[PDB]
Every structure is written in structure tokens, then in C-alpha cells.
Design a protein around this nucleic acid. Structure first.
Ligand code: CL
Ligand code: CL
Ligand code: CL
Ligand code: CL
Ligand code: CL
Ligand code: CL
Ligand code: CL
Ligand code: CL
Ligand code: CL
Ligand code: CL
Ligand code: MG
Ligand code: MG
Ligand code: MG
Ligand code: MG
Ligand code: MG
Ligand code: MG
Ligand code: MG
Ligand code: MG
Ligand code: MG
Lengths: 123, 123, 123, 123
RNA sequence: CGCAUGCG
RNA sequence: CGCAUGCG
């Protein structure tokens, strides 16, 4: 009904700036939504939040807390060659990964280096 | 089960400085938590946020964002005689109140003078 | 072609938050535009900036610098009964009025008290 | 007419601290001003902004926003051997560069390592 | 308290 | 450097 690329681009078009943690969260939300076939509920929920006057950022946090697939979900791993591969406005939002990070607690993704070292992206 | 005073003391124990906007947030949190019997789940949430690398200040903010009693809650009105009754480190964080302030958006409390004039505390 | 009220409301609908210095600047821009019959050039210039991807705030500053009526213009006086009459997100942007304040240098308006004391709103 | 070195010294004389992002901005300003013969109008704009109550830091920002040579100007690339060659008080203000940085948007300079890796300075 | 964006 | 908004 909507593709993960169309949704991503729709959400990107509502976000201030570029390569922010919320941008990374768009990618995470759309990849988990595609793999669990929930892109349409994510889409509808997004556009309802906007219609009620929430910020797109609020709308994305609301998604992580309301849509079943993100509830209790662990952040997905993203492979990187170096910290230079991390989006350009996330660098100050990185921390060691805790034992049980959750998307509904602001853990967007786990960046993983070639040596297996990990960095948690945190909202 | 922890009492309101014990939770306040643990939280004050983690905070930097004296009479800050976050010391004021501790009192608001402990009072609402006591009235909804949420003191324990607030304590669990404080210590869970610290464990994943939140500052104490941020961890108090996480309480307002995740503990159900703080969802959409209006800040308490605190009656004062003069501006000097507000802790000095809170002064920089005062501003006129919005139409419908909410604790989970940063509005800690509303100071109110005898002639009904107000000063909002916003982190 | 467009009324000062319709334009104001259009510009207000693009501005983040409420009662900010840029909100006051909308009122100033639309009152000087009405009195000099330049509301339509102000309107067209505003919507061209947005179409090119400028922020509404950028668009308003661009207006003060490009539209003849604001060039070398002094801030208009606004009468107030007290500092409480100043929009609720301008309080930290007030200063003594200089001898020659200009709109194209970020002097939005001059607030004047009943005793004749003045406060400059500065961007 | 003031020389580049004299203008730098006047500006350093107004600034707090040592090796800050604003000391770096002074050097960029003085170098571009010297190359476009804008040193005098930069000096006039610095002293005009101070006179109307701008901090020295803000007054340097006003130069980039009002003096024509800084309009849409790209930050200079400064070649370095290591990160330690960047003044220590500038480190907090480093970030990855955007596609098309502009001085009048806050991009003071771009530090460049021997292998071509970059660090932007953003106030 | 901090990050992001916008603006000076 | 600061203000504004958003978010934690
Ligand atoms: Cl980009
Ligand atoms: Cl990957
Ligand atoms: Cl880090
Ligand atoms: Cl403080
Ligand atoms: Cl106190
Ligand atoms: Cl309002
Ligand atoms: Cl009036
Ligand atoms: Cl003041
Ligand atoms: Cl500094
Ligand atoms: Cl240095
Ligand atoms: Mg964007
Ligand atoms: Mg202490
Ligand atoms: Mg507000
Ligand atoms: Mg109200
Ligand atoms: Mg608004
Ligand atoms: Mg100094
Ligand atoms: Mg940028
Ligand atoms: Mg580039
Ligand atoms: Mg913003």
C-alpha cells in the first residue's frame, strides 16, 4: 500500500535538518515496518499525529511506543567502517550499548565496527 | 517500597548544585508519585535511566516522560509572597506560563503571587 | 489583494511556538505593509522564500532587508501597561533602546510603558 | 583604515577566554576582509553592534550576517596534521561538514587532515 | 541538564 | 556566545 522508500522520504520531508538521530530513526522504523508488514499502520499513525498538531519528531516517538513491532524491540545493528559512516548530526548522541536497549526507550540502532565494537545511538 | 522523603534524598544525592530547577522537579515528582502511589516505579525508572547512561537531570526528565502519572499532567501551582521565594538557581528558568502547561513538556511548576501573577518554571 | 489580518495569520501559521520575537515581527511587518500599501509585495516575497526552502524566520528577515518600507525604518512604538503585556516568549530579547534603532538590524518594536519608559525588542 | 592585525587585536581584546571558536572567527573575518578590502566596514560593523548592546561574540556574528563579503561565503579550508592542532576550546564546536557550508550560517572554517578527512567548526 | 533544528 | 522552537 506504501513502500518503505516512499514512507522514508515522506518522513524525511517533515524532519528539520539532515542526518539527525530522528533521520536514523526513520530508516529503522521503515525497515522494521517492512519486515513485519506494518508500514501502513506506521504511515497512518504518523499522519494522524501531524493532523493533531504533533511535531514529526513527536510522531516518530509515538510510533515507537504504540506500534507492536517496536514495543520491547531491540535496536537493529548497522555496520559501519568508521565513525565517519555515522550520519553527520548523530555524533554527540552515541554511547556504550547497555545489556538490554529498547527502541521505545530511545535506542535507535546499534552501530557496529569491523572489529565488532558497538556504539548505541540514543534519543 | 520507598517513602517520598527517601526518594527525594536519593535524587538530591545524584544532582549537582543547590536549588536548581531539577531539585524543584524532584519535589514535584515525589509529591505526584506519593499521591498516585507511583514512588516505586518512579524509583525503578530513575535507576534504569542512570544505568543506561543518563545524567541525573535527564533521568528525572525520563520519569516525566515514561511514568504514567506524569503523562499530560499540569504543573502544580505553588503560592509565593515574592519572587525572592523562588530558589536563585531557578530564576534563569522562569518564563510566562503557556495556555495549558504540561509537566512532560518541561513545565515543572507555576509560582503564584498574592495578586495572582504567575511565573512558570520551564526546564 | 490580501488584508493585513490574512497575511498575519498566514505568517503565524508558519512560525514555531507562540509569542516569539518573530511573531511580534509579523505584526510589525503587516502594520507597516498595510500603512504603506505593500502587503502584496511582502506576501509574494514571503512565499518565494518558502518555495526556495528558506525558513519562515529567514523569510521575515529577508523582508526587513529587501522591501523598501523596512529599509532604514525605525521600530514602531507599542504601548504596554507592564512587562506582562509583552508576548510570552520575548522577555529575554529586550534591551534599552539605542539612539537609532533599525528594523533591518533586528529592532522589531519599541515597547513603551505608561510612564514613557521604553524597551527595545531585538532579533 | 585599520590593518588586519590591528583589527584582530581589537577583537581579541573584547573576547573572553583563549582559543575559542570566536577567536578562530576573528582570523577568518580578518583574512576575508583583507582580501576584499572590507576591513574598515567590518570595523564599523563590529563597533556599531557593540554600541547597540551586542556581546563581542554576537558582534562577530553580525559581521558575517551584514558585511557583503560574508554573504553566502564558504568557510576556508585550514590544513592540519592532527586533531591536536585545533585550539582546545574549539573542540566542542567541531562537527562533520555539510554539503555546502556557509560562513553566514555559522561554519567558521574546515580543518583538513593529510588524508583529506575533515572537521567543521560550527558556532 | 543535554542533543537537534531555526535565527541573531 | 545567545535567544526561539522541537525532542530526550
Ligand atoms: Cl546533508
Ligand atoms: Cl548494515
Ligand atoms: Cl562518543
Ligand atoms: Cl543550575
Ligand atoms: Cl533554595
Ligand atoms: Cl500561546
Ligand atoms: Cl500600541
Ligand atoms: Cl530585560
Ligand atoms: Cl568557549
Ligand atoms: Cl590555541
Ligand atoms: Mg530536513
Ligand atoms: Mg548537590
Ligand atoms: Mg512554550
Ligand atoms: Mg495557562
Ligand atoms: Mg506556532
Ligand atoms: Mg580574552
Ligand atoms: Mg548543519
Ligand atoms: Mg561539503
Ligand atoms: Mg527548531
Amino acid at each position: 500500500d506504501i513502500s518503505a522508500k516512499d514512507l522514508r522520504n515522506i518522513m524525511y520531508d517533515h524532519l528539520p535538518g539532515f542526518g539527525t538521530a530522528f533521520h536514523q530513526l526513520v530508516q529503522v522504523i521503515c525497515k522494521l515496518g517492512k519486515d513485519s508488514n506494518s508500514l501502513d499502520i506506521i504511515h497512518a499513525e504518523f499522519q494522524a499525529s501531524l493532523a493533531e498538531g504533533d511535531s514529526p519528531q513527536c510522531a516518530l516517538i509515538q510510533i515507537t511506543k504504540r506500534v507492536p513491532i517496536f514495543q520491547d524491540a531491540a535496536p537493529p545493528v548497522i555496520h559501519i567502517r568508521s565513525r565517519g559512516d555515522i550520519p553527520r548530526a548523530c555524533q554527540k548522541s552515541l554511547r556504550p550499548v547497555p545489556p538490554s536497549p529498547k527502541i521505545d526507550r530511545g535506542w535507535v540502532c546499534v552501530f557496529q565496527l569491523q572489529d565488532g565494537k558497538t556504539l548505541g545511538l540514543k534519543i
